[PDB]
Design a protein around this ligand. Structure first.
Ligand SMILES: NC(=O)[C@H]1C=CCN([C@@H]2O[C@H](COP(=O)(O)OP(=O)(O)OC[C@H]3O[C@@H](n4cnc5c(N)ncnc54)[C@H](O)[C@@H]3O)[C@@H](O)[C@H]2O)C1
Ligand SMILES: Cc1cc2nc3c(=O)[nH]c(=O)nc-3n(C[C@H](O)[C@H](O)[C@H](O)COP(=O)(O)O)c2cc1C
Length: 364
């Protein structure tokens, strides 16, 4: 099974290619990593396996979900260190995903109830609703379009968060540039209506992600930086008029960052709609992989068989699984044995209980 062949993700020697995709679970009460997260990640960690954490706040204004962890305070760093240590005790490699939601927020999630920030002043349309802390679904508000000095401040929040992740012991970080969140609000021409140097052309729309990646590369080293994008996921109004062209423009910028810094990123991670079309989606994924000079993680709707095929055919180096890892803590082992997989309960994806729907899914 080629999913169980080793792979060198730059400095990290992985024993297999099954990756834990980043998943927000909302157990990090008051944005502080909790003991329950340590139990959750330890259950899923394997010797030589790679894990990516749930999206993690880079600043007080970066959240749009309840009880998501941060890594912008030293208290958060101390609590993350305990979690990273239990994962490393199982021999796994773990990256912290750095996440800013941009306009996908609400006053309940912002300090002083201030407006969320974005590339644009337009709200997400009322086709979409935000999960509120009380479990109801609310209305996304009008965001504030930020100026270019404030863009450079957000880049610095990424840089400081990356340094804090290294202080907590993480092996690296992943830039969350997917799903209609802040970076994607700059990338996608269905959101970015700016008329300054961060809007309009492909080069201008790619400036923000290039600056974020370059800042974290300079701070922690390219080999400790992964980047996640989703050119053809339209979540939260995030559509582009030419998704492949946009994806190839992002890939070209990552290739140039690597050339200019003389080192390769840890990986490019591309995610696609995850609910079953097939040939077209596989061609987009392979085209982005073929354009990128480095390690490629594919994601979204992969099965055991599709993961094996992706690696065997050279279409990806690593395969990330999200939802199946919620309910199969030993998913790596189940994939190795071809053992039946257990269902997940969507109702407890984003609840706060430290056990129920979080660490109580059994092993084989
Ligand atoms: N937590 C996060 O940041 C989410 C970001 C994006 C993807 N999320 C989850 O990943 C998994 C794979 O997502 P997939 O690519 O399959 O698409 P969905 O986001 O599920 O979109 C399917 C349709 O569901 C409706 N829908 C999804 N989210 C919202 C929302 N927030 N408000 C209103 N409708 C919503 C829309 O019809 C979508 O086309 C799903 O469990 C999904 O809920 C997680
Ligand atoms: C509950 C839940 C939370 C998620 N949170 C994140 C997140 O924090 N960051 C991210 O990049 N993607 C997030 N995702 C998307 C997943 O990483 C994954 O790409 C998606 O579920 C599709 O892969 P799958 O078909 O293997 O589940 C989340 C998905 C779910 C279902």
């Amino acid at each position: 099974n080629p999913l169980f062949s080793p792979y060198k993700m730059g400095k990290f020697n992985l024993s297999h290619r099954v990756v834990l995709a980043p998943m927000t679970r909302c157990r990090a009460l008051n944005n502080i990593p909790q003991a329950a997260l340590g139990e959750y990640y330890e259950q899923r960690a394997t010797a030589g396996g790679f894990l990516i954490t749930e999206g993690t706040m880079i600043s007080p204004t970066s959240a749009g979900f309840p009880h998501v962890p941060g890594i912008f305070t030293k208290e958060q760093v101390r609590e993350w260190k305990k979690i990273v240590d239990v994962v490393h005790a199982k021999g796994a490699v773990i990256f912290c995903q750095l996440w800013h939601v941009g306009r996908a927020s609400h006053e309940v999630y912002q300090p002083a109830g201030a407006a969320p920030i974005s590339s644009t002043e337009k709200p997400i349309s009322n086709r979409w609703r935000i999960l509120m802390p009380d479990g109801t679904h609310g209305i996304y508000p009008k965001p504030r379009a930020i100026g270019t000095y404030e863009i450079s401040q957000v880049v610095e929040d990424y840089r400081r968060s990356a340094l804090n992740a290294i202080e907590a012991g993480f092996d690296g970080i992943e830039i969350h540039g997917a799903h209609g969140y802040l970076i994607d609000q700059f990338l996608k021409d269905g959101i970015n209506d700016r008329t300054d140097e961060y809007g309009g052309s492909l080069a201008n729309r790619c400036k923000f992600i290039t600056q974020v990646v370059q800042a974290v590369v300079s701070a922690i080293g390219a080999d400790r930086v992964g980047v996640r994008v989703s050119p053809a996921i339209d979540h939260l109004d995030a559509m582009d008029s030419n998704p492949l062209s946009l994806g190839l423009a992002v890939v070209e910028r990552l290739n140039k960052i690597q050339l200019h810094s003389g080192s390769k990123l840890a990986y490019l991670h591309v995610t696609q709609p995850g609910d079953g079309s097939e040939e077209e989606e596989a061609r987009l994924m392979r085209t982005l992989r073929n354009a990128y000079q480095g390690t490629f993680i594919c994601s979204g709707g992969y099965t055991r068989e599709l993961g094996i095929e992706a690696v065997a055919q050279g279409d990806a180096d690593l395969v990330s699984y999200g939802r199946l890892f919620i309910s199969n803590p030993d998913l790596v082992m189940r994939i190795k044995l071809n053992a039946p997989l257990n269902k997940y309960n969507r109702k407890t994806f984003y609840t706060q209980d430290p056990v129920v729907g979080y660490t109580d899914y059994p092993f084989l």
